[PDB]
Amino acid sequence: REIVHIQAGQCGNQIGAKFWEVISDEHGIDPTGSYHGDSDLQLERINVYYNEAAGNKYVPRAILVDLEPGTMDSVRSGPFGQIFRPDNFVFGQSGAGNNWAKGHYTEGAELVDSVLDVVRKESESCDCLQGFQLTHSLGGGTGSGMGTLLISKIREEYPDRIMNTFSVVPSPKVSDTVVEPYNATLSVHQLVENTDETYCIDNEALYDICFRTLKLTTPTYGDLNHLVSATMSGVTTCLRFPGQLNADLRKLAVNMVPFPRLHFFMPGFAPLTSRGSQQYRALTVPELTQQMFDAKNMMAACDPRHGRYLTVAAVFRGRMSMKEVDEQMLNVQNKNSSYFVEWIPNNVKTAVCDIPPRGLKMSATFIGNSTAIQELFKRISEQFTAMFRRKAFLHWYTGEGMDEMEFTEAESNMNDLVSEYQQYQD
């Protein structure tokens, strides 16, 4: 049942604010308020993300790890910012340098113990813990570093409970940072070896999907974040709801990972229509699979159409026919037999909740494991070498107590990770 989110770095943090902004409303929890829940079902399973103390104060059970005060001091000084128990804030007032050796070895390493402390206060909350949700970006000093540490510790403390990771892998076209592949390659490394379910969401893949699939002309970050947080809610929290056929982290993992690498997915939301007009309601269902399974609409950068799938998990959440669901999935599996890897009569783990996204009639989160994500770690891995070769901004790492063999390690590891994934595309 229980769950413990982890906001590593600024990004992973910024997103925390959006993941919790959402989720709460999808659970009727006002800032410090309690359960105003329009219904009574948005409560029997909350535990997964909160804790009982007062009686109106169900506090999010997440961790906020970061070596840059200003950040958490923006998330804690704004809207829902005053719901996290201060104990949750594991800051590192140090210099949150943009190096993959600052928020993981020098500055973050200190703030860690004051985090694990809480991650235990929340885990030992009550009932039975399932796993922890982790949001962050693999392109910054804390985050890919400090958040990637938070897990390496979590996975030593409860190698039983699961670990879903929501990573904002460095978008292609333009990088919102410079060392990006440094902070990234270094964090993916930690991921491929601790968390056991990762949902990679691209930034520019979002813009696109947010500027053409939502005529939205000024897609602020808040938005992107908001869209992402929309998917991670469909995944976890959702399945912790009833359903004709419900699953749960485990079900998504034991049905999505054919080979231990850990493999990375690419989340996709269902009703993604522009506000007014578009409100076509063409959501009978063929419309959702129409959506989810198209190229654009995959939070990832790469396009599915560029590589088979190993597994797929349409985690729908809104009253529908186990027939029009189970059925559609099929044609889909046959119209595209081409790309869907050898097991046609399958490769589509159908999941079905009941209650939908608060204000919507019918939605369906998509979690695709398309060997396609090979063509992303490739990207990342490339950027590294092209700059590692010249040790570009390496002094900001080493000078922070790092190793010339550390970077080697990660790249290789994550680089091999690319290799393996191909072992199935063939």
Partner: protein, 410 residues
């Protein structure tokens, strides 16, 4: 004389609430009358709660409603072994406390849903613990086998190759109904592209009612649970017959309802009506246990069947002569006050080992492989309660159910 019935798994419970409804409905015993004669098991409270919150609320004793607040888990292992274990004792206790109170009973009933967690696993050991505590009775289990193409759970087969092998030696005669080949029934014989899982359950929830419920109920040609396995399995392999129902007509659309026996019986062998793929040609090879219920004249049967025995395109049984166990009950069948089931005054829940499934079985087995193809959705059961064993070893199981239904005929 009397029986009990154990509705296991959310489904077996939904179907249970249904079969249990039709009952009072044709016995003049409203909401609050006598006292049932069964129990309800599930490792997910919210579902048995539906019997505790919804209709037919006070017609049960909070004692014949077993729940394990814990976790269901769509995996046999966790249900059979690990979790499901904890409850079993308690479960049994009722089927030993309810089995005592009566007067010379005839058998148990298992209403379960083959491919579930609480339905596959649990029962597996429930029927298991029964075959030993009352080997001297009938164990007719009314199942709702995996839809031939429209399954739900990702693992389903793991859970159904495992409930078959463990229950086989305890009694088989496990009716087996798969919406996949049936669900089509809801689209070809009832018309509705809106079939909620709550429907396929109402259906098996029907075919099953024909197994235990009514059969353990007096009639003009009673058939005990033992009867099944005896008249239904030619060989020790926990042989898997297929469940089929006849008047699966829509309670809205068409209305020819008054479809004398001569019709409803022929409607069983056409492959498009057997809750299991659907394509075994006319009927096609078997031991069949034609359980009828409602107003039926034994000659009507001992004629309607005669006509069949000579259709040849329905090519039957081997070494032994005659494979038609005619089971006649009195009380006609029931229907969810307002679901979508016609509501006739006679039906035929025929379940054999060959018939169209027969093909159905294979068309459902093949499915499995494709996915298992390399463990497939195994990681979904392991973390819940299962090994490469239960899957692979329940596959081999049915394999000899494809050979069985083949040998006993053709």
């Amino acid at each position: 004389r009397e029986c009990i019935s154990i509705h296991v798994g959310q489904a077996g419970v939904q179907i249970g609430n249904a079969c249990w409804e039709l009952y009072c409905l044709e016995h003049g015993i409203q909401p609050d009358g006598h006292v049932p004669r069964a129990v309800f098991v599930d490792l997910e409270p919210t579902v048995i709660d539906e019997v505790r919150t919804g209709t037919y609320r006070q017609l049960f004793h909070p004692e014949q409603l077993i729940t394990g607040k814990e976790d269901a888990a769509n995996n046999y292992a966790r249900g059979h072994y690990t979790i499901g274990k904890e409850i079993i004792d308690l479960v049994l206790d009722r089927i030993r406390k309810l089995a005592d109170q009566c007067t010379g009973l005839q058998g148990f009933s298992v209403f379960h849903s083959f491919g579930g967690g609480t339905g596959s696993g649990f029962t597996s050991l429930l029927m298991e613990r029964l075959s030993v505590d009352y080997g001297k009775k009938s164990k007719l289990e009314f199942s709702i086998y995996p839809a031939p193409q429209v399954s739900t759970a990702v693992v389903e087969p793991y859970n159904s190759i495992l409930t078959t092998h463990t229950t086989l030696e305890h009694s088989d005669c496990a009716f087996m109904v798969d919406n996949e080949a049936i669900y089509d029934i809801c689209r070809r014989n009832l018309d509705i592209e809106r079939p909620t899982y709550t429907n396929l359950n109402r259906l098996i929830g029907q075919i099953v009612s024909s197994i235990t419920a009514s059969l353990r109920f007096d009639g003009a040609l009673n058939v005990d649970l033992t009867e099944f396995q005896t008249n239904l399995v030619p060989y020790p392999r926990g042989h898997f017959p297929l469940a089929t129902y006849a008047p699966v007509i829509s309670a809205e659309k068409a209305y020819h309802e008054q479809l004398s026996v001569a019709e409803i019986t022929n409607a069983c062998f056409e492959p498009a009506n057997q809750m299991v793929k659907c394509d075994p040609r006319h009927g096609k090879y078997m031991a069949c246990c034609l359980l009828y219920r409602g107003d039926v004249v034994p000659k009507d049967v001992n004629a309607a069947i005669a006509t069949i025995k000579t259709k040849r395109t329905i090519q039957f049984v081997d070494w032994c002569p005659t494979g038609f166990k005619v089971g006649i009950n009195y009380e006609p069948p029931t229907v969810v006050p307002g679901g979508d089931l016609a509501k006739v005054q006679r039906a035929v829940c025929m379940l054999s080992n060959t018939t169209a499934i027969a093909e159905a079985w294979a068309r459902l087995d093949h499915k499995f492989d494709l996915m298992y193809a390399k463990r497939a959705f195994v990681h979904w059961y392991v973390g819940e309660g299962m090994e490469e064993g239960e899957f692979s070893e329940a596959r081999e199981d049915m394999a000899a159910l494809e050979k069985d239904y083949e040998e006993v005929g053709v």
